[PDB]
Amino acid sequence: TDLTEEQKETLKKLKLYQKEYYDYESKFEYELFLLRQKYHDLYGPIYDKRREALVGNGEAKIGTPNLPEFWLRALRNNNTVSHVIEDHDEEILVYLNDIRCDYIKKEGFILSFHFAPNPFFSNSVLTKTYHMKPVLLHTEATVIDWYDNKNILKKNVVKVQQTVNRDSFFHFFTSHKVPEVAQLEMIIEGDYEVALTIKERIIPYAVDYFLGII
Amino acid sequence: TDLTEEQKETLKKLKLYQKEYYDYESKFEYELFLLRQKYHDLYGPIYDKRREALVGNGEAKIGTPNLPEFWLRALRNNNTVSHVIEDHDEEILVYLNDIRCDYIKKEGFILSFHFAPNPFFSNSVLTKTYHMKPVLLHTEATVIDWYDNKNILKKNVVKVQQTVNRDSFFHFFTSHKVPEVAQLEMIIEGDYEVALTIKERIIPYAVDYFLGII
Structure with missing residues (x-):
């Protein structure tokens, strides 16, 4: 609101770089969310194999x-x-x-x-x-x-x-x-x-x- | 300590599957630690570009x-x-x-x-x-x-x-x-x-x- 024009161009630049940050932040959050799922899946079967060993259900x-x-x-x-x-x-x-x-x-x-x-x-x-x-x-x-x-x-x-x-x-x-x-x-x-x-x-x-x- | 032999084989299996879990856990922790660094680096320049805009140092x-x-x-x-x-x-x-x-x-x-x-x-x-x-x-x-x-x-x-x-x-x-x-x-x-x-x-x-x- 209360800046010189030089200081405004410095803000454009800052607003610009802070946008690029927000993009990379998103790319990371995406990649991280890939990575968590990828392994949630990897685990599943192990948990099932363990359930199979405890229960093994023809009956219980x-x-x-x-x-x-x-x-x-x-x-x-x-x-x-x-x-x-x-x-x-x-x-x-x-x-x-x-x-x-x-x-x-x-x-x-x-x-x-x-x-x-x-x-x-x-x-x-x-x-x-x-x-x-x-x-x-x-x-x-x-x-x-x-x-x-x-x-x-x-x-x-x-x-x-x-x-x-x-x-x-x-x-x-x-x-x-x-x-x-x-x-x-x-x-x-x-x-x-x-x-x-x-x-x-x-x-x-x-x-x-x-x-x-x- | 106080189990039947059937229940012991069930424990082998459980110990086995819990080892495999620990491996996948490691693979994830590794991959996650890749991912964090990959982006720590991506950010750097942005932070520097922002520093450059605020300071731009031939003097200060x-x-x-x-x-x-x-x-x-x-x-x-x-x-x-x-x-x-x-x-x-x-x-x-x-x-x-x-x-x-x-x-x-x-x-x-x-x-x-x-x-x-x-x-x-x-x-x-x-x-x-x-x-x-x-x-x-x-x-x-x-x-x-x-x-x-x-x-x-x-x-x-x-x-x-x-x-x-x-x-x-x-x-x-x-x-x-x-x-x-x-x-x-x-x-x-x-x-x-x-x-x-x-x-x-x-x-x-x-x-x-x-x-x-x-």
Whole structure:
């Protein structure tokens, strides 16, 4: 606004060079996004080969039958995840055959929890979908179809029942938003920390967490 | 330790697949590290072309003479950096011709502050070097060779002088370590936030911060 004409030509040049920067930045972001996919694909089969070794499914009525309690125990050896896995959850996570991560067809990712048929719920898969633009927009999770007397999220009977909700890993499968705000924020920062650990540590290094060396 | 032999063969397979993962992970990290360099280089000249436009040096006795107060004002339009730039620093940052970032020949990066000859100090460049392995190990910065009565870091004369240190952007050019701990941590988390802003926002988008659109 308030410059000499010489200083304006210097700005043209600067505006010019800053445009060229923005182009190269794009070329990089593109190439980087190639590179991430190229390898997301490379990994897939490995994850499947590992699933095949744990499950090998002509049948199953318990989780990862070729190596019982694999996922539970691998989850339990992560510090961040273990915090939220309580002892009453253990007998549900035992039926877990698999954990997977996908991209969706501003982006995001779905975390898939594949379970064997179990007395707790009918869902064969529970997913949690993180929408993003980095910066998180909102989440979707599947509504667990708990069986009668089998909602761990809630207390239980026995002594006229008396009922009172309690913490559980499976409070992970709820949905959120946002336009007081700390309570609201603090739920998002803890939930995302878990999803990230799973997505980038548990899933990649599962057996290493199992073996107990991370 | 406590498995059946079938479950052991399932572990061989898992150990096997987790090795293959680690290989692909390496291939990616390599390719990614190609890609970052490839473009660090691509940018260089642009940054130089921009320096050439601001300075164009057959001479200079003030900062960025072809567009006075460019860097100062670009720094002042960043929220994180501006916080630490005080008003007494302004008359020193005015002599700033350039800001650059380099890699070093576990890694790190040097941030270079190139100044025109000025009444505050003789240093033609002030650098701050962040050593890392991500996770920060320790920093090096240049000892500013302040001239007599020209140390802004410290109060001043006039009314037998009376002296008392005070905050300044240029407390940025100090060195650190670590094996109470919060005071120690809190210095590192604020200092690094500044270096990062410069390295990834100011330097790349300098004129845009100047123009006042970020």
